[PDB]
Amino acid sequence: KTRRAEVAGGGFAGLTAAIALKQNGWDVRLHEKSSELRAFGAGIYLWHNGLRVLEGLGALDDVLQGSHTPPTYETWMHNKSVSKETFNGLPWRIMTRSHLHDALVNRARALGVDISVNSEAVAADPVGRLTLQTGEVLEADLIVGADGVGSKVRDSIGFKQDRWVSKDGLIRLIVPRMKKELGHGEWDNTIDMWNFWPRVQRILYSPCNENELYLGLMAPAADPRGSSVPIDLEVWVEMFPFLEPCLIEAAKLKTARYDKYETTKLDSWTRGKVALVGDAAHAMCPALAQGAGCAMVNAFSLSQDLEEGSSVEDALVAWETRIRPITDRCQALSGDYAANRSLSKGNMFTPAALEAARYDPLRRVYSWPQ
Numbered sequence: 001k002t003r004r005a006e007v008a009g010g011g012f013a014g015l016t017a018a019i020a021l022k023q024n025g026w027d028v029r030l031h032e033k034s035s036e037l038r039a040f041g042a043g044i045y046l047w048h049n050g051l052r053v054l055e056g057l058g059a060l061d062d063v064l065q066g067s068h069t070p071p072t073y074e075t076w077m078h079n080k081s082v083s084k085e086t087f088n089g090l091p092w093r094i095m096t097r098s099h100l101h102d103a104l105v106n107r108a109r110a111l112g113v114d115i116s117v118n119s120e121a122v123a124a125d126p127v128g129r130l131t132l133q134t135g136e137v138l139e140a141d142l143i144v145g146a147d148g149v150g151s152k153v154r155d156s157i158g159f160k161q162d163r164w165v166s167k168d169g170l171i172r173l174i175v176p177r178m179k180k181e182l183g184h185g186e187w188d189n190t191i192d193m194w195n196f197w198p199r200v201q202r203i204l205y206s207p208c209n210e211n212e213l214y215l216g217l218m219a220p221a222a223d224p225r226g227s228s229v230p231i232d233l234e235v236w237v238e239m240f241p242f243l244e245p246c247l248i249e250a251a252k253l254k255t256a257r258y259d260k261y262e263t264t265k266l267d268s269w270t271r272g273k274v275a276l277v278g279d280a281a282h283a284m285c286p287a288l289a290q291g292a293g294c295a296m297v298n299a300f301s302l303s304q305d306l307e308e309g310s311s312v313e314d315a316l317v318a319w320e321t322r323i324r325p326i327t328d329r330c331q332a333l334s335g336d337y338a339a340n341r342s343l344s345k346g347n348m349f350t351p352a353a354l355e356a357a358r359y360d361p362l363r364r365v366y367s368w369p370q
């Protein structure tokens with residue numbers, strides 16, 4: 001009589017879905033294809049919307065402890081400060097990916113979510129079957145495709161898909177803060193350091209806590225030095241000399257990767273008893289820092305709609321209808337910002353830009369008015 005859910009993917013979306021369902025009394029199994037549970041991407045920003053999901057997951061305290069809210073979100077163009085934004089009190093937070101992942105994993109385990117590593121979903125059936133790489137077929141009342149941008153769950157079913165790949169990427173790293181070595185300045189701030197001259201090179205500077213700094217080093221794919229990993233120390237120091245102590249530490253990271261990314265928009269997110277959440281459904285440009293925030297809101301919202309006393313099929317349809325427009329709008333605006341390099345101007349976290357962030361999934365209203 002206990003409802004059964006199978007979740008494919010052990011990322012932020014899958015873990016969120018698993019915790020939220022388990023909290024509602026579902027028997028939940030989560031499948032992670034990797035040998036271990038781990039989050040990549042170095043660091044991550046969350047906002048009010050994602051912090052509220054964490055609150056609703058009972059995972060907020062572990063996240064806030066050991067993460068950071070900068071005094072301000074500052075933007076530079078060619079080393080000149082062009083804006084400082086604090087979003088009228090809107091809560092936000094920076095942390096390492098592992099920090100967020102660990103909080104979600106610990107909460108999942110505390111609740112008795114069944115987690116299988118080395119377990120890869122290769123197909124899903126709308127009537128409620130999930131097939132693993134081994135050949136094993138699992139039956140369930142709900143199947144969640146939270147398996148990222150190349151979702152086999154999605155592709156095993158076939159969803160009409162708008163796909164785009166970014167030509168340019170970036171290198172994301174965690175390094176020591178080296179705060180004392182940085183000297184005079186406001187080194188607790190987020191600082192988005194844009195340049196187009198003498199070359200296109202940008203650093204998003206993002207403190208995660210008193211010990212760890214998240215750096216995003218962005219240069220065109222066509223730049224053989226700026227895009228190099230391990231980093232070409234000289235060309236980063238040249239344009240960002242005030243960050244030399246941290247860049248010296250970054251140069252030690254021989255695991256650095258130049259990551260490109262893609263965006264995804266689907267004609268829908270559901271088929272029968274199958275729901276797609278996270279990047280598998282709606283991967284977006286990083287400009288508004290809402291990829292995971294939207295993913296978490298969506299996975300959390302899915303659990304909510306499954307409490308209405310409907311069939312799973314109808315609840316899934318109602319879920320997309322209810323919650324998707326917030327993601328569609330955020331994805332679109334983020335895409336525009338990215339295409340137009342809008343963030344380079346500063347002062348671009350407008351009310352419309354902050355729309356996803358303002359959404360409270362717990363009370364289902366918009367908060368922190370701008």
Ligand SMILES: Cc1cc2nc3c(=O)[nH]c(=O)nc-3n(C[C@H](O)[C@H](O)[C@H](O)COP(=O)(O)OP(=O)(O)OC[C@H]3O[C@@H](n4cnc5c(N)ncnc54)[C@H](O)[C@@H]3O)c2cc1C
Pocket residue numbers: 008009010011012013014031032033034038041043044045046119120121122146147148149152170260261277278279280283284286289290291292293294295
């Ligand atoms: C450069 C960059 C910066 C970003 N910055 C932010 C930010 O600051 N704030 C924010 O909110 N978002 C940010 N995002 C977006 C955010 O990273 C993603 O939206 C988020 O990680 C999506 O999580 P997910 O669980 O949907 O997918 P993923 O994180 O891709 O996780 C899926 C998990 O899938 C497991 N898996 C894959 N295939 C299978 C399978 N077949 N079977 C079982 N398991 C499988 C994967 O191995 C992994 O464990 C950023 C994105 C990029 C590219």
